[PDB]
Design a binder for these strands. Structure first.
Ligand SMILES: COc1c(NC(=O)c2ccc(NC(=O)c3ccc(NC(=O)[C@H](Cc4c[nH]nn4)NC(=O)c4ccc(NC(=O)c5ccc6cc(O)ccc6c5)cc4)cn3)c(OCCN)c2O)ccc(C(=O)O)c1O
Ligand SMILES: [Mg+2]
Ligand SMILES: [Mg+2]
Lengths: 402, 517, 517, 402
DNA sequence: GATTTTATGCCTGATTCT
DNA sequence: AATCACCCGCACAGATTT
DNA sequence: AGAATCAGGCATAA
DNA sequence: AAATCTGTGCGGGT
């Protein structure tokens, strides 16, 4: 039944794998350690034992083969966890949403049918990589997008990068890296809140000074700030946008109601700013970063890149040029799935006992886990819909601003 | 090795999968009423130049191109998606023109990829109209190597006319088809009065219109669905009882069946029912549909009445079906339950945006062309000094520098250049230094290069006049485009003209009959 | 219902099938040694621009293009044909460079079409050299829409180099590989002397040369095959006996195996033979072939003798095989049995034809270009009258008629034309009325049109000098081509130069060792 | 199991079809009269019973299924033609060489194993079409290539085409049709003798005046004749070849022969127009056609196509222009196999009792048929090779050409 | 993503008759 | 060359239990 | 003991 | 004799 059993008959040093698909199963069979490892490919999605009746579980072929392979019994008055084979169990599914779904199905099966196996800690999860980077001599694998971004940033600032501001200063490493990291963090904070405001306004307000509410007044001071902002926004346009502004008062503070129009005859009629926004911490950190980010460049300025020099303004394009220089001799490959990887890659990346990485599954609380399983994997649609709605993007819009 | 709790892993994985499926596979977009797979298939077929008046192509070519380039999923699903759009009995207005064995109403089968051919339909070119004029946005593919549209600049109300059906995690959508002329009339009525109520819209749109021309039995579910977005209707077949005198024989002739029903299953179910004696009064059953229409003949016993057995068949078998209307769609990347007025408003706003972007692009192109023609006309009026300067120069670069160095007098062509409305036909990116100065012209680098590319053939009179004619035509076009961008009323006139043209081109007649109980 | 006799139906059907299989499926062409499927695959890969220094393409795309355009047959046959050309252990000189898993000598099988990629090899571009200069005839494809070459203008002796194997109706063909340098030396020797006998040729071509570097046993069969066209040879494997003293026990090490022999089947057959006590003195068998090379180890019993068991292995096992040489090929669309001299003569005649046609095409192109260059020079000599005449032209046609119907003064350019006299550069199709008559040039219609399509950019001095340089070099090119066409020894000199260049570029060393019994 | 039975049970009104391929069988099953028609798809090529043994004939799957479907016995002492099901049998294979090979295999099986079935007339052959042509409104199917040529000729001369010689005559149909038919027949005759003469030499002779061998004798006009022929050949030569002539008076009638040097850089010895060529009827019909194809066109001439006009100066140019105009709104579909046809097309073409077309197979001589089967399908290679060589191109040299 | 046994002719080895 | 056995949500006959 | 007969292997096609 | 329970199929995915 597609099972390539191992030779080690002692059930204290064996391993078992549950590979997704047929090509990946064949590659694993080619690249395995023949001594104490076994391969059990799964062709497609398996039954959901939470919903299905007990009769159909025995009729299903996949779960029947899995139960036979494990060696333990099934059902009350027959289960016996002592008689176990393959003390180590690894999932090793793909790195996309369907792989996660299959993983959840397998976890539900194991937790509902064999609580003792999960409690004792015999179930593990593998972690194959996603990207492969090659740079002539330096080549390696990178997992997840965040690590790829970190690697790209590190390679961009791998030596050199002496920012000549006026005559000859030198941040020299740590200061520049800290500034870039803070700028990236603020960029991410801006992107997550991108829905509620335009990108241009948030990108431009950082350069502007603080609101200066201390000297604010109903006339001759409230208008100047908004007029300066609208002037600095209007002179940077490429899509036929237009910015207009107005202010109002409510006997406590003078609030702003800026408006913008682009490729539409309609108008939002308000992008209000009042005490609530300035009191928030997001604008505080924006101004904190903007304090360092000012017009520090003099008439002469450049970056002492490796055998290169690009004297220009608009440091964003300077960073883009640095990235282009970094990516000049870099090649990237993005694996589509486990089928792409040849047996040697699978052996050295996930199945090697001395260089693999895995995760152990354990249970913290029993009642909470049971309630979660009943809520998600049950056959009551309304609780599942409510749970998905509650953890939707509305709850993701965290206003901690830190 | 590092421990991880089961609850966190389960929560993260299942939420990720659900969020991917909700906005990735099932639900359609309200503006154009297409799922991602349909949009990718249509864009791939459009890029290949597989027009509606050219040769066919094998299905394997298109499926392989779609899988390799844009859509990284299985091939069977993509081929089934392509096959469904070419069936006359599935879509009210087909979007693909097919050739081969694509199946029949019995739901038998369809030939494999290597035995069929396809191309775009004539109506489909309306969905992708003005795609090259920066009317919509583009997004990267699954690996940052290609660009795919974010939404098509549709001109047909696709969602209402073709309907929708989809299953997701936690929700589902089901919308029936409609008729094109009624929907266009409703849209025009909405444009004429923006505070229109549901009754005014339903005066033009009585109800759905299925491809198979069944009978709708009821009038309350349609109103409930159009008012709240959820409802239920009953679709009934078409049948009649005829008497040929002689021996007082009665036979039942079935012509039209409901929507989404397999004829063979219905026939075999009736045969099974009469075999088990669950239905009394049925003697014989036959099918006689051959190349002209659908006919099913049922001969009844002499000791029974046709009406009773007909009502029993309506109550028991699949000759009457229940359709549950449930309108769910993506508004701004979030599921939402809508009604008729919301869909109409969304379509109108989409049209306004598309027309505005198209107008801006056309204005930019016209200004650039007028700018080039100004320099050409100025150069043609000073032939002798220009050729002398070119001859004396040793290299083209030196000639270009010499041309750009000094100003050039306007000559006899100053009448039309100064007749323009100041900056009507002046590109924005051009600096104020160049252009028509006080009594003299200053050339740019690209203008000089265009002058150097002029051929000796243009010195003839007709070629001299054609440039002036084109310049005046471009001035008129720029004035018209500026006037369109000026007010907010001309835009509605353009939209109404386009809608009326579409109605006159692609209109058709009604099929389904709506009747009371 | 027209009756028909069984005999005529059987006769016509079987004769049609047999002739089609004989002249369209199995046997190769003597001039280039390629079956029709190979030629179609190479042409399809060349038209797509899948060169040897570009990115790869998937196998499915190429296979689909071949099936759709040129080859109306299935996919498995085409894919297997493509796969067999990329295996280093099948062809002596590979024609396709493939990336993926194309099998291995152990007995594995290649992956599916969807998981592999291919492109042309460097040597393949020699087969399709000078294909665009009208060197070979084109024929219609099955549907009468496209054109396919009748034969490639090859530059490599592909038939002898790569051999062939095929089964037809009533006959079969089987030819082994050879070494490139030996074949080129034989061709050069034949060119030097056309009365060379087989004894002279065999000094330069000792015998076959397989990819796997086996041993060839005996020498009479090779001579008989090359003299009459039919023969037999014996291919023996390479093995030796090693003893490391100490225990004094020997082992048999096998490094190489014959041509077209599976390693796994050989090993399992040996295991089955030694299991049943059919071969005595064999204790253990092992395989250690990996990365570095091939090694098979046989440990014999302590009291046995290695030589006796080694000799028994050749008699019983598959370490020695028999190859039957049988040369059959198409000469002029008919099967025929060949020998070495006939193949060499056919290749030489093909090369002569190709070079002659190429020279004719080049001469025609040179004369046609020189005509227009003379026209442009004469026009530039008199720029001011030309532009003055054009300025008074109501339309281009009137200007062209005015230019055509008038003589022109040569000016200072006539001295250059003194070198072009004697009707050296005049096109053959040109009438005697036009051209220089009495020191005054005469223009034709096409020359006038070329003058009217002249840009101002070419009025500078450097652009004027370039035309004179081009004309001066074109005169020398015309003289060289005429001298090549004027004699027969120059053709043989060119052919010898090409052969020597090919030998220097693609030559390599020998692998197989030939020994007597 | 791969057999769609018919509901009719009387074994005298049923039929059996032996379709090639699985997709073709699937298409055919939908479009058939379910009452009294059965289908039996064949996946590929089938066993050759002439070379095989009886045990292997019983072992094979396709022939066993066919024997079970027919219902009669197999082998001696079991065969009984009276107990026959499906009293009509139709082959309906593809329209290419592989279809012909499978047809020959099926005929061999039927004749060798069931002589009485063939003798009594229970075997038929179907004739599916190849081309489908539509011209806006009309639509029709065309078999093979000759009918396509006839259809093209008819469409080209369909209305209008009133050829004007000087002012406004009108050939008006029949004369033009006869001239076109004679020209096509002469071209067909010329195209089949390319080995014995160059094509250009044969083409050039039709337009030149008749040699008039009767009154030639020894007037020494042969020199002017051959010189004019060579000059005309070289006037419009556009491939680099050259022509020369040689003459001699070895007999009373002076003889001449051309020598041609062609792109191969080798010169042929001669192509002598001996007494056979002048005395043959081929030259007589060529001269007869040339008599009608003299310089009939005047200084100005044109062709009167429907609502169109174009000047012409040669018969070939007029025919080419007419053919090009005829292909304006014409759509042609070519069927690569039975799998390309939807069920409606198959029904209306090959399976409709009142519009189909078939051939009945019958036996004329027994000994001749047996000898032919033994020679062609037997396992003796040399008689088959000799038979193929005898009917090869050496026997294709038919001197009639009419 | 992977799924059956046939035709056609020249060599061999394993096996069967007189 | 079309077929294998599971996930997701909504509405509906005929089959089991109170 | 030696003729006779039976299979499997190679490369493009259903 | 009211109320729970068990199956089938529509259209894009392993
Ligand atoms: C020959 O045709 C031609 C052509 N040709 C072409 O133009 C042509 C061109 C291109 C391609 N293709 C490709 O380039 C490509 C590229 C990439 C891929 N993908 C992959 O590699 C990846 C790997 C991977 C990722 N992760 N792990 N592995 N696969 C997958 O993600 C993947 C997807 C799905 C599945 N399983 C299922 O869904 C499935 C189902 C049922 C189940 C049932 C069960 O019970 C259980 C399970 C089941 C599972 C498993 C894995 C694939 N193809 C092509 O191939 C076929 C296109 N259809 C072409 O034919 C043209 C003209 C003619 C003519 O006649 O003129 C013609 O004849
Ligand atoms: Mg995946
Ligand atoms: Mg075929």
């Amino acid at each position: 039944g597609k099972l390539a059993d191992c030779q080690e008959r002692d059930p204290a040093l064996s391993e078992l794998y549950l590979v997704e698909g047929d090509s990946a199963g064949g590659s694993a069979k080619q690249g395995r350690n023949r001594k104490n490892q076994a391969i059990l490919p799964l062709k497609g999605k398996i039954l959901n034992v939470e919903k299905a009746r007990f009769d159909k579980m025995l009729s299903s072929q996949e779960v029947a083969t899995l139960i036979t392979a494990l060696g333990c019994g099934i059902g009350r008055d027959e289960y016996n966890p002592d008689k176990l084979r393959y003390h180590s169990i690894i999932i090793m599914t793909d790195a996309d949403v369907d792989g996660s779904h299959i993983r959840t199905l397998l976890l539900t099966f194991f937790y509902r049918q064999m609580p003792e196996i999960v409690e004792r800690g015999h179930v593990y999860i593998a972690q194959p990589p996603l990207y492969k980077v090659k740079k002539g001599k330096q080549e390696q694998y990178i997992k997840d997008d965040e690590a790829m971004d970190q690697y790209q940033i590190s390679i961009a600032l791998d030596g050199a990068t002496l920012h000549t501001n006026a005559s000859a200063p030198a941040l020299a490493g740590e200061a520049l890296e800290k500034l870039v990291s803070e700028y990236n963090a603020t960029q991410k904070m801006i992107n997550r809140m991108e829905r509620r405001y335009p990108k241009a306004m948030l990108k431009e307000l950082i350069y502007q000074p603080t609101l200066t509410e201390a000297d604010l007044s109903d006339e001759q001071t409230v208008t100047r700030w908004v007029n300066a902002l609208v002037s600095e926004l209007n002179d940077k346009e490429q899509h036929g946008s237009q910015w207009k502004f107005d202010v109002h008062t409510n006997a406590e503070q003078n609030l702003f109601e800026p408006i913008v129009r682009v490729r539409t005859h309609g108008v939002d009629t308000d992008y209000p700013l009042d005490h609530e926004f300035i009191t928030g911490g997001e604008y505080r950190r924006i101004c904190t970063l903007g304090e360092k980010l000012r017009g520090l460049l003099e008439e002469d300025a450049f970056i002492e890149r490796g055998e290169r020099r690009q004297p220009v303004a608009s440091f964003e394009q300077a960073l883009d040029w640095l990235v282009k220089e970094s990516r000049r001799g870099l090649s990237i490959q993005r694996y589509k799935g486990l089928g792409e990887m040849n047996p040697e890659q699978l052996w050295e990346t996930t199945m090697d006992p001395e260089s693999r990485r895995m995760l152990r599954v354990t249970v913290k609380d029993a009642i909470a886990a049971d309630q979660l399983f009943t809520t998600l994997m049950g056959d009551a649609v309304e609780p599942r819909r409510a749970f998905i709605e509650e953890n939707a993007l509305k709850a993701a819009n965290i206003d901690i601003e830190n | 090795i590092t421990p991880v709790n089961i609850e966190e892993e389960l929560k993260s994985s299942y939420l990720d999968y659900a969020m991917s499926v909700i906005v990735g596979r099932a639900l359609p977009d309200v503006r154009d009423g297409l799922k991602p797979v349909h949009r990718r298939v249509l864009y791939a077929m459009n890029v290949l130049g597989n027009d509606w008046n050219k040769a066919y192509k094998k299905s394997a070519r298109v499926v392989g191109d779609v899988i390799g380039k844009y859509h990284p999923h299985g091939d069977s699903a993509v081929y089934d998606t392509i096959v469904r759009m070419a069936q006359p009995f599935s879509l009210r207005y087909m979007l693909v023109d097919g050739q081969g064995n694509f199946g029949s109403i019995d739901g038998d089968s369809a030939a494999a990829m290597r035995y069929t051919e396809i191309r775009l339909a004539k109506i489909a070119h309306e969905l992708m109209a003005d795609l090259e004029k920066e009317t919509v946005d583009f997004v990267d593919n699954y690996d940052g190597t290609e660009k795919i549209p974010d939404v098509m600049p549709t001109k047909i109300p696709n969602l209402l006319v073709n309907g929708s059906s989809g299953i997701a995690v936690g929700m589902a959508t089901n919308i029936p088809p409609h008729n094109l002329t009624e929907v266009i009339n409703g849209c025009l009525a909405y444009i004429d009065d923006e505070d229109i109520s549901i009754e005014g819209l339903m005066e033009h749109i009585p109800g759905p219109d299925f491809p198979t021309a069944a009978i709708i039995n009821g009038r309350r579910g349609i109103e409930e669905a159009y008012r709240t977005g959820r409802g239920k209707v009953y679709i009934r077949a078409r049948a009649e009882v005829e008497v040929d005198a002689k021996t007082g024989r009665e036979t039942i002739i079935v012509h039209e069946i409901p929507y989404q029903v397999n004829k063979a299953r219905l026939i075999e179910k009736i045969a099974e029912l009469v075999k088990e004696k669950r239905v009394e009064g049925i003697s014989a059953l036959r099918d006689e549909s051959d190349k002209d229409g659908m006919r099913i003949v049922i001969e009844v016993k002499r000791d029974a009445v046709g009406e009773v057995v007909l009502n029993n068949l309506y109550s028991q078998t699949q000759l009457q079906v229940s359709f549950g209307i449930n309108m769910v769609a993506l508004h701004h990347g979030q599921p939402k339950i809508m009604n008729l007025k919301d869909i109409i408003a969304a379509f109108v706003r989409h049209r306004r945006e598309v027309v505005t972007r198209r107008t801006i692009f056309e204005l930019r192109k016209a200004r650039d062309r007028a700018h080039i023609l100004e320099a050409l006309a100025v150069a043609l009026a000073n032939i002798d000094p220009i050729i002398e300067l070119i001859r004396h120069a040793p290299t083209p670069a030196e000639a270009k520098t010499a041309l750009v160095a000094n100003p050039w007098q306007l000559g006899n062509v100053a009448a039309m250049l100064e007749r323009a409305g100041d900056d009507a036909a002046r590109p924005e990116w051009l600096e104020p230094e160049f252009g028509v100065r006080d009594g003299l012209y200053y050339l740019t680098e690209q203008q000089a290069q265009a002058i150097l590319d002029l051929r000796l053939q243009k010195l003839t009179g007709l070629e001299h006049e054609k440039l002036l004619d084109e310049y005046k035509e471009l001035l008129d076009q720029i004035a018209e485009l500026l006037r369109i961008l000026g007010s907010a009323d001309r835009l509605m006139e353009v939209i109404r003209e386009e809608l009326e043209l579409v109605r006159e081109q692609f209109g058709d007649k009604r099929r389904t009959e709506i009747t009371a109980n």
